[PDB]
Design a protein around this ligand. Structure first.
Ligand SMILES: [Ca+2]
Ligand SMILES: [Ca+2]
Ligand SMILES: [Ca+2]
Ligand SMILES: [Ca+2]
Ligand SMILES: [Fe+3]
Lengths: 357, 145, 40
């Protein structure tokens, strides 16, 4: 009876129970989940931990290098944009009848990362053979405690949910082999990965180290002049990231030609049009490198389009989409009492300072 | 300390332009250093304890005395809670929090963006479901995490 | 035997710009090279 603005929806306080989310066969009801999560509605902590654990069990069974066949939708970095994730599934096709391959980076940046994790983990449980989730550089314990994802779990839910995600991200596969043609990673190649068996030999169930091929899978980036190189140095130090390497056009072409592949799908880097097809390989005729970015209007300032890749019927359909309205949040999930209390303490002090003189 | 009462009597006397024993808002706004301040009216409403639209010398001392170094953390948070609680019913409702914040933020936030963070603040800080934040609920978020 | 590439574009993004924060009032904190993300 004391609410000035009614133009925004009042978020619900009823935490979804285990009976409202899960059916009688242990299948999560994604319809109740989407409708509740989009209203900024929270789940019961026991349910939030149940969706993470049952999903991580399916992820722990999967291999380091997944076998995915066409038709399949290839998504890029989401970065906690849950209300843009809802438009991504409408552009790329409903998950109930379309294969999906995500390339990581589901958390951090966007202030709806836990909503993205709970919804993508619920689709992974409901579709354990048609939907696939790979790991990015942000699905670790070092970046989430630095990029407000730990704060997102502690404010919306509890620190126990954050601990469950750090154990669920360790189960995310590293790479994927799509249709025996394309290698799908997050960052890119590595100076320690010559064959696809080098991808299989890695122990992904750990925190991504600062070295080794596991770090280069998620952190490496293409050269700024990819395709127009000054030298032939295959891997140089990635000076922007501070770790991993820069892979060149001769490096990717040699890798594509050695393992008899066509291209390398990846994300990890923002694109103004949501995608970027790099220089064609002289021995294939197809773009040797393809960056995919599924975050429209990155950080609410980039004003960029986001693209998804729907590979079907020998056609690589890069389908773009724009952003969607999302609720507002103060930086680092700060409440209005913490934000305004210093201003209250300061300006009131200035009053008596000048009143009493 | 009767020395402070006599010393603050002169300062209260200069602020009294009409010499009515009370201080109106326009008599406060005679201070050029209090113009650019969104919480002058709230402090005047907190100091006033009858509704005369004016702060007498007894209300002046009762209000100013809560700001000396001699005072526990509950005294300071008592005044801070009364900043948002406008009607002085003991609790802060959704409108009282939106209205007071509207003064401090000016136009740095739109109404649709200020209302969203106000609701989510109370939602994650209303341990009783009454739709409002109490003094103990106000203290469980301020001071520490 | 390469596949065909088709781009399905859309219209420009429609979002809301935050009004510039008057430092005199209660301002919102700011958030923080433009192509790659952020180093550890
Ligand atoms: Ca007077
Ligand atoms: Ca009075
Ligand atoms: Ca009240
Ligand atoms: Ca309450
Ligand atoms: Fe990344």
């Amino acid at each position: 009876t004391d609410r000035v603005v009614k133009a925004v929806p009042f978020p619900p306080s009823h935490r979804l129970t285990a009976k409202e989310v899960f059916d009688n066969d242990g299948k999560p009801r994604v319809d109740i989940l989407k409708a509740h999560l989009m209203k900024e509605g929270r789940l019961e902590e026991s349910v939030a931990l149940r969706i993470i654990t049952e999903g991580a069990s399916i992820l722990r069974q999967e291999k380091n290098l997944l076998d995915i066949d066409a038709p399949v939708t290839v998504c890029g970095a989401i970065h906690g944009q849950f209300f843009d994730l809802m438009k991504l599934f409408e552009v790329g096709g409903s998950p109930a009848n379309t294969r999906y391959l995500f390339l990581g980076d589901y958390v951090d940046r966007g202030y709806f990362s836990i909503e993205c994790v709970l919804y993508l983990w619920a689709l992974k449980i409901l579709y354990p053979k048609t939907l696939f989730l790979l790991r990015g550089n942000h699905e670790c314990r070092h970046l989430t405690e630095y990029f407000t994802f730990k704060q997102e779990c502690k404010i919306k839910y509890s620190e126990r949910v954050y601990d469950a995600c750090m154990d669920a991200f360790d189960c995310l596969p590293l790479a994927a082999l799509m249709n025996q043609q394309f290698l799908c990673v997050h960052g890119g190649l590595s100076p320690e990965i010559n064959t696809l068996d080098d991808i299989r030999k890695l122990d992904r169930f750990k925190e991504p180290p600062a070295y080794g091929p596991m770090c280069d899978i998620l952190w490496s980036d293409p050269l700024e002049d990819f395709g127009n190189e000054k030298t032939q140095e295959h891997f140089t130090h990635n000076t922007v990231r501070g770790c991993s390497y820069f892979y060149s056009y001769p490096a990717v072409c040699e890798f594509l030609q050695h393992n008899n592949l066509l291209s390398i799908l990846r994300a990890h880097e923002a694109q103004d049009a949501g995608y970027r097809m790099y220089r064609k390989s002289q021995t294939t005729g197809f773009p040797s490198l393809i960056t995919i970015f599924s975050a429209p209007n990155y950080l609410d300032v980039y004003n960029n389009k986001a693209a998804v890749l729907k590979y079907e019927n020998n056609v690589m359909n890069i389908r773009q989409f724009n952003c969607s309205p999302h609720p507002y949040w103060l930086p680092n999930f700060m409440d209005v009492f913490t934000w305004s209390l210093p201003f209250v303490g300061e300006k009131v002090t200035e009053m008596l300072v000048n009143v009493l003189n | 300390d009767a020395d402070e009462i006599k010393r603050l009597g002169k300062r209260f006397k200069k602020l009294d332009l009409d010499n009515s024993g009370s201080l109106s808002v326009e008599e406060f706004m005679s201070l050029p250093e209090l113009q650019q301040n969104p919480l002058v009216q709230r402090v005047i409403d907190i100091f006033d304890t009858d509704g005369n639209g004016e702060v007498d010398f007894k209300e002046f001392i009762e209000g100013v005395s809560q700001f000396s170094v001699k005072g526990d953390k509950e005294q300071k948070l008592r005044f801070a809670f009364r900043i948002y609680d406008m009607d002085k019913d003991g609790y802060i409702s959704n409108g009282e929090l939106f209205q007071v914040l509207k003064m401090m933020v000016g136009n740095n936030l739109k109404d649709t963006q200020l209302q969203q963070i106000v609701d989510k603040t109370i939602i994650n800080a209303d341990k009783d479901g009454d739709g409002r934040i109490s003094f103990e609920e106000f203290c469980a978020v301020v001071g520490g995490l | 035997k390469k596949p065909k590439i088709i781009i399905t574009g859309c219209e420009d993004n429609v979002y809301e710009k935050l009004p510039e924060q008057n430092s005199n009032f209660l301002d919102v904190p700011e958030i923080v090279p433009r192509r790659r993300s952020i180093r550890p």
